[PDB]
Design a protein around this ligand. Sequence first.
Ligand SMILES: CS(=O)(=O)Nc1cccc(-c2csc(NC(=O)CSc3nc4nccnc4c(=O)n3CCc3ccccc3)n2)c1
Length: 827
Amino acid sequence: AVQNDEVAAFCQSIMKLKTKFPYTDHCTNPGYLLSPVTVQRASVKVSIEIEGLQLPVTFTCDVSSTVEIIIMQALCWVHDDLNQVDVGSYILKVCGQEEVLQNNHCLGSHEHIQNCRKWDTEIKLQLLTLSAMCQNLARTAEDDEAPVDLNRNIKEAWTATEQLQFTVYAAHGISSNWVSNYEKYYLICSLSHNGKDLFKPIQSKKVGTYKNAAYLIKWDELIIFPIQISQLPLESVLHLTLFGVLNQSGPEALGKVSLTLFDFKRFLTCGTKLAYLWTVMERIVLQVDFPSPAFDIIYTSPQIDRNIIQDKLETLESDIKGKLLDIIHRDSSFGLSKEDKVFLWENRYYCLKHPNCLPKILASAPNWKWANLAKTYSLLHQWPPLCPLAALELLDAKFADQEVRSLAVSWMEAISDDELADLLPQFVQALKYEIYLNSSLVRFLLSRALGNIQIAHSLYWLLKDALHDTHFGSRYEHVLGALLSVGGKGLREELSKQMKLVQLLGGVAEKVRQASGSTRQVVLQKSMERVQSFFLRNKCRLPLKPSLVAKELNIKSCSFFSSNAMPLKVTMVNADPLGEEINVMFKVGEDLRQDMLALQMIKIMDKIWLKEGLDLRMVIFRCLSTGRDRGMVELVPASDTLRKIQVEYGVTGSFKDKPLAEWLRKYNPSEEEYEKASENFIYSCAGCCVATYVLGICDRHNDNIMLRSTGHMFHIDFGKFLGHAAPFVLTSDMAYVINGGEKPTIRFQLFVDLCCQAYNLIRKQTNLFLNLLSLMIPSGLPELTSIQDLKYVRDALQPQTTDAEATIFFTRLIESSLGSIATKFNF
Ligand SMILES: CS(=O)(=O)Nc1cccc(-c2csc(NC(=O)CSc3nc4nccnc4c(=O)n3CCc3ccccc3)n2)c1
């Protein structure tokens, strides 16, 4: 009955958000995907199709020049004098791909450009105007005008002395497999804020089902906490963990319930409140009765302190300033001893010069008591703006305060769509630490989605994948409903076709696995015919890369890889005849979400390196979980497992060093071509080695390691992630490729330099990797479950030590990985 009120006011806020994104604004409503930029620290051939020219124009562009000047370098090839064409109208799309280049960005800073250079493929763009560039996704006047629908006494609280108490009445609708399995049941009640218990939990008494009511458990027990309303922060949560002692022939948790002690309008919970814990998907109703005074108790925030605290200061230098600087320059807040905490908290007004340390300060607060909020808030308002990545820590569970979080979101406005897009999973998890449906965060994400179609696309797939969390399933239903609503008729119809495609592909995969031995191909062709029927009545965009528009299935290219998963090779025809055909893997019966995380962490190491001008030539491939234990995976062309290389070589010749080199000589015959390709191997192997050690991917064998024909090395099956007890292994044929001989060369010295440089550049961002892995804890991936799992990664990243002693540390890992051939080299 406030739940309906809360939703109603959300919708009101979301209508008001929409008014800032009118259909007419091409900036915020372009109707097309933007080709992604990743800002980079020389020259290239671009081929541009031009309307009314039989041949496309090919010329050299300074990779450093802006798409804007390139657009008319290309009008200068057809037009001798360009006053009689409006350059503004013209845009540049990638051939085959309904994605448009960003005028005010470098050519070199586009993902599509960096990728072509890496693979040495033809950059193929199309010159065209806004009028002729597909806009089927654009929002309409109807969409903007349309409504938002989804899928008296006053005591203040600081004066309220009433002790927090409530009666756990009953649970209703317990299944009959429960009434057999367990005799008695019991609730563990837990009171928390900032993700931590305020008091030790209180157990209810142990009670069986009520007389003549096998669907009902009745406790009718008053529970009293040793705390009064005054002492409860606004974001205080109640957690009733229902448990069940097994009948003869340790009681198991049967479900959890969340209950905010205040509601969205700051009023304390009064009266009877119902919550729903889910077990299949069957709905049990828990009745908690809170007191009903004649009066409403409302949380009021303290009186604001306007004092501005600078100018004259103690400026003591007894090494106390040095110790403060030491903890300011500490990698992170992780491991920070209670002593380091009080020290910071006192010299906090001296730290005002180093904005990105605020998280250490807030985590070193003595408490979040009403009294002390006034001085913590004063600081926050005079505090300088934080880097968006630094602010991310302030949306973790640790900081539940609504002013901290809302201010973290204001600093984050600074971030580019292009960087947020690779950070969306973390942001979708953080939504579990907003106790209220409306919040600065969900408005920030919904407003970014309105303004940028890649972000709306990715939010879609990530919210759908969060619906499956039984505890937060309802929160995410309302966030999804608001996104789908505010996205328009255009966006939703493509997302429906996209949903429809993945479901059919999943059906096909299930049936192919069910089919046994021969006739598996015949089953694939028969099941694929329904997808053939689906494309006959629909053009559809590819979920993995919605820039690609499939129109048709190519059945004779459609295949199944030979594996326990039996993944399918889905080949599709591009709807643009300027395009190349579409190849993806659809895999069923593996939870891809962890594969997705490995990839993201690798991609962020890439970006960190590119930032500092280090290019390790990394293969960056996409993976999307479409539901639970299924999704679509990018296929890398002209690549093969290490195993398969060694096997092929084993048939002719018995030299262990020769196989990788012989495979690369076959696809790169010229000495220059072989050199270019072994150098791609040096660089990409180095990135792979660093990534393997930091992320703890210790599972690397001849099957997990892949090799593109161009020389680039990469990993595919991230089965073991953050693994505990040489973390990477360099075989003798890997060594041969880097040396380019069986004796060592300065190419091996280039390999170690690259490993160490790249390693230090990741250690300088230790705090980003920790925040990005903590924010994924609530996601329920098996080997990322506690704040201990992070410590292994921090341990691997060795942050106390200089770049000098880290370089010695990693160089010793390389000596160790070489195993027995290590003796051939000099360290
Ligand atoms: C310009 S174009 O459009 O015409 N070329 C193009 C474009 C896109 C894709 C393909 C394509 C078709 S088949 C393929 N893959 C291979 O050649 C190597 S196999 C393999 N590659 C993996 N890449 C990544 C992530 N994962 C994988 C994985 O799992 N595999 C399968 C590994 C395997 C080996 C042996 C038995 C079972 C599974 N790319 C072409």
